[PDB]
Design a protein around this nucleic acid. Structure first.
Ligand SMILES: [Mg+2]
Ligand SMILES: [Mg+2]
Ligand SMILES: [Mg+2]
Ligand SMILES: [Mg+2]
Ligand SMILES: [Mg+2]
Ligand SMILES: [Mg+2]
Ligand SMILES: [Mg+2]
Ligand SMILES: [Mg+2]
Ligand SMILES: [Mg+2]
Ligand SMILES: [Mg+2]
Ligand SMILES: [Mg+2]
Ligand SMILES: [Mg+2]
Ligand SMILES: [Mg+2]
Ligand SMILES: [Mg+2]
Ligand SMILES: [Mg+2]
Ligand SMILES: [Mg+2]
Ligand SMILES: [Mg+2]
Lengths: 110, 103, 117, 150, 140, 56
RNA sequence: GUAACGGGGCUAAACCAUGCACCGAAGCUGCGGCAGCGACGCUUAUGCGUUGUUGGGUAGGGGAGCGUUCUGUAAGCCUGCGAAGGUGUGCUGUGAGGCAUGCUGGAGGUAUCAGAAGUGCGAAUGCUGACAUAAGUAACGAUAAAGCGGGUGAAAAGCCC
RNA sequence: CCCGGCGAGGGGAGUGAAAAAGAACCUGAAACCGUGUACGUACAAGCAGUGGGAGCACGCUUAGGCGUGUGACUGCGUACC
């Protein structure tokens, strides 16, 4: 794998995380923060974690120290959703799907 | 030089151009026997004598080449009322090629 | 004693579902399409094809009329002249001569204009 | 099926519904339409229609099956190993073939994956006569008129 | 081959200049609607995209035939409830030949897209060749 | 509040248009050659130039 | 809201009479092909080429077939030098479908003719399961609201002081 | 071994014929949800296709007038049970 990091579940729903993901791409890399560290949403803190872990795999997985890179890939996928009942007006309306996601961050050359 | 003719349709617009047509009869196979068309020729319609009609001088026909006389085309085409569907049918032809030497 | 239609089942659906165009929405993803839309395609197809034989004819004469009249005698008078002949009577379609062999066509309007008794 | 109860789902109302017992041939839970019984299967053929056209083999398998020899008397008590020696007398071995000597002697020694079958006796049906390559009629004299039963 | 001149993407465009101050008024519209498509044209098959390029002048020189100089109703209703309907007899509108009268061709065209491509794109005006805010180049 | 046919596919994808997020754009200030967050200055010692939060 | 020519627009682009011409349907003709029947030519079981003709179709009647699971023919044949299954593609059949093969796949499958069916789904407010929609919308449970300084901690409005 | 809260999760390395077998683990289809690329698309009305059809992206061929995708514009034209 060309230095990835991905994820599994996370527990913040795709749509939620998919939003902040768009914020970063193209240049990125050197943007491990600022464009991420200055946007407070649960999804943000999640992408950063894996973002660093990913850019970290620049010294272990392959060469090319942390400075260049690109982050040509970022996308969240629908992860298994937990189910829970919801006490309501006699129990008519109750589904509740926690929903989860990932991140699958990537970093390479330009 | 332009030209023209009928046969299962007046498909003879183009000069020579080698275009598909109908089919022989007994059996296609290629080769040839040199079947000159008829004086349906648009008089050749190409030269200082692009005559209003094919009726310009006697004997004037093109020789069929018989390039390729096979192939099909396949087309579903299926009707259906509200209580049934004849949906299932197919009827095609091969259409011989022919190149036609010259008018 | 083993139906397990699942086998042929998957095949039947995939067959019709194979509508490249994708048309739009459920017309591809959902099997609902098939007899609903794929069937329509077959219907709209059965008539339009053999029907078109005229749509172009309506066109041929539409342009044939717009060409022959530009130089005396309209489409109504045209074929009327062409009508008289022992063998002279090359039909329309190629009659689009007006676009390529203009001289020929205009030389074909005389075969009628002067033909009309 | 394990249908332990009558319809307990309140017919009218409850939005989508309509149901009764649960053996219900539609309920995934269980219950199969018109089941299926042990039955008999066994159809019976007339007595005459039974003997009709059987050992037609002779004429047909002429150049193949229609040979008559012996039940190999010298065959040891219970030995199949040297059955081959006796098989080569016709060069027909694993080519199946059944014998019809009409004597449940030690010749029933034929035991293998599937080749030579004894059954040398009156009890014999075409199915076998056709399931093999060269039904060695043998027996000798056993074959007579209408009752040439082997 | 497949006889049918392709779609030159309206490759032809012959400029022309009518007079408007004629003796047929409404009869003229047709020769305009026909022109803005494939009338005097032989090739450039209609149906598909196409057109021409002519232009009106004064136009204020029309009177129809009968007493149509007093009718022609004309009411450009505007989706605004409160009782719309703007009835204005021809002569009452002939005061300012705008989206009407001279624009009698709009109703004669294929209508909708493509046909609307021709529409007013022929110019009108109302003064002949005195002030031509339109293209001056080649015309007939 | 009923809801007949629901055009899930395509639709909503348009409402999502006004849902995309936005990026920031601020300086780093003199001392901090990077952070400064947004129109602040720095967090390290929390100061714009001197005794603020816990600096020198 | 024109709304009592479909619209435009028409003094004849109306009507009446007269005659010719043109447009115009899956109707008829031309060309090719499919199938049933009568004939024709033959050949002559048979069958094929010519021809006349018939081929809208609900209930329904009749006649032909495809495909699937299992049995025989099968320790035969196909396969780890890659089976079933999933996916693409190409050729093929009137259609049900058929075959060849790329990739996946990790072990089985079965020409043929015949036999028996838990034998073919789009609907029954069908049964089970999975996933959408509304929608990141409503709502977060008594209107007895809380502020601050420390501590801890990756992080404290909610935890400890 | 490395990122991380001595998390979760993951990236290497090693086991293995395979980890495109990692314990959610055989094969893994469909609905449904995404990232990427080619084309269409912000003055245009309706079962969304069908017929015609330009252009554009690639593929063509010692042109030869075609293949695939997309389809502006245009005649028609109210799903199934
Ligand atoms: Mg016309
Ligand atoms: Mg009871
Ligand atoms: Mg309901
Ligand atoms: Mg059961
Ligand atoms: Mg008996
Ligand atoms: Mg129209
Ligand atoms: Mg006529
Ligand atoms: Mg017709
Ligand atoms: Mg019928
Ligand atoms: Mg099987
Ligand atoms: Mg049904
Ligand atoms: Mg709402
Ligand atoms: Mg609100
Ligand atoms: Mg509370
Ligand atoms: Mg798996
Ligand atoms: Mg536009
Ligand atoms: Mg087409």
């Amino acid at each position: 794998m060309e230095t990835i990091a991905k994820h599994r579940h996370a527990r913040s729903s795709a749509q939620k995380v998919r939003l902040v993901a768009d914020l970063i791409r193209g240049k990125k890399v050197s943007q491990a923060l600022d464009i991420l560290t200055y946007t407070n949403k649960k999804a943000a803190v999640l992408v950063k974690k894996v973002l660093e872990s990913a850019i970290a795999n620049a010294e272990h997985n392959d060469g090319a120290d942390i400075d260049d890179l690109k982050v040509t890939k970022i996308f969240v996928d629908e992860g298994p959703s937990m189910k829970r009942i919801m006490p309501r007006a006699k129990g008519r309306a109750d589904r509740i799907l926690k929903r989860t996601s990932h991140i699958t961050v990537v970093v390479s050359d330009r | 030089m332009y030209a023209v003719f009928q046969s299962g349709g007046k498909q003879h617009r183009v000069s020579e151009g080698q275009t598909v047509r109908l089919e022989k009869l007994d059996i296609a196979t290629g080769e040839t026997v040199e079947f000159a068309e008829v004086l349906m020729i648009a008089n050749g319609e190409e030269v200082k004598i692009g005559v209003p009609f094919v009726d310009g001088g006697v004997i004037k026909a093109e020789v069929v080449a018989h390039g390729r006389g096979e192939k099909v085309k396949i087309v579903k085409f299926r009707r259906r009322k509200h209580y049934r569907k004849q949906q299932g049918h197919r009827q095609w032809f091969t259409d011989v090629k022919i190149t036609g030497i010259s008018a | 004693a083993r139906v397990k239609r699942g086998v042929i089942a998957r095949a039947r659906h995939k067959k019709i579902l194979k509508q490249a165009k994708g048309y739009y929405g459920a017309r591809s993803r959902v099997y609902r399409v098939a007899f609903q839309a794929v069937i329509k395609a077959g219907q709209y197809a059965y008539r339009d094809r053999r029907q078109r034989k005229r749509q172009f004819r309506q066109l041929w004469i539409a342009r044939i009329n717009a060409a022959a009249r530009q130089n005396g005698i309209s489409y109504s008078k045209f074929i009327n002249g062409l009508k008289k002949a022992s063998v002279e009577i090359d039909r329309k379609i190629l009659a689009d001569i007006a676009v390529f062999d203009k001289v020929a066509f205009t030389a074909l309007v005389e075969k009628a204009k002067a033909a009309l008794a | 099926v394990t249908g332990s109860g009558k319809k307990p789902w309140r017919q009218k109302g409850t939005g989508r519904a309509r149901s009764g017992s649960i053996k219900s041939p539609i309920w995934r839970s269980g219950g199969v339409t018109f089941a299926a019984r042990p039955q008999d299967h066994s159809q019976k053929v007339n007595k005459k229609m039974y003997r009709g056209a059987l050992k037609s083999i002779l004429s047909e398998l002429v150049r193949q099956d229609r040979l008559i020899v012996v039940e190999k008397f010298s065959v040891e008590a219970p030995k199949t190993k040297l059955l081959a020696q006796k098989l080569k007398d016709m060069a027909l071995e694993d080519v199946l073939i059944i014998t019809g000597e009409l004597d449940e002697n030690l010749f029933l020694a034929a035991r293998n994956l599937h080749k030579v079958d004894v059954r040398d006796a009156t009890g014999i049906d075409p199915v076998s006569l056709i399931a093999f390559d060269k039904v060695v009629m043998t027996a000798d004299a056993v074959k007579q008129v209408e009752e040439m039963l082997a | 081959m497949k006889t049918f001149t392709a779609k030159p993407e309206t490759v032809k465009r012959d400029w022309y200049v009518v007079d408007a101050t004629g003796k047929t008024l409404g009869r003229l519209a047709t020769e305009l609607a026909r022109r803005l498509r494939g009338k005097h044209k032989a090739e450039y098959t209609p149906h598909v995209d196409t057109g021409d390029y002519i232009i009106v002048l004064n136009a204020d020189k029309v009177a129809v035939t009968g007493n149509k100089r007093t009718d022609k109703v004309y009411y450009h209703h505007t989706g605004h409830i409160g009782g719309i309907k703007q009835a204005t007899f021809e002569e009452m509108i002939a005061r300012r030949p705008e989206r009407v009268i001279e624009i009698a061709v709009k109703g004669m065209l294929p209508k909708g897209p493509l046909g609307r491509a021709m529409f007013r794109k022929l110019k009108v005006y109302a003064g002949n060749e005195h002030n031509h805010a339109a293209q001056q180049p080649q015309v007939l | 509040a009923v809801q007949q046919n629901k055009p899930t596919r395509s639709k909503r994808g348009m409402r999502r248009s006004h849902d995309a997020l936005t990026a920031v754009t601020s300086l780093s200030v003199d001392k901090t050659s990077g952070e400064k967050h947004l129109r602040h200055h720095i967090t390290a010692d929390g100061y714009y130039r001197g005794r603020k939060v816990i600096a020198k």
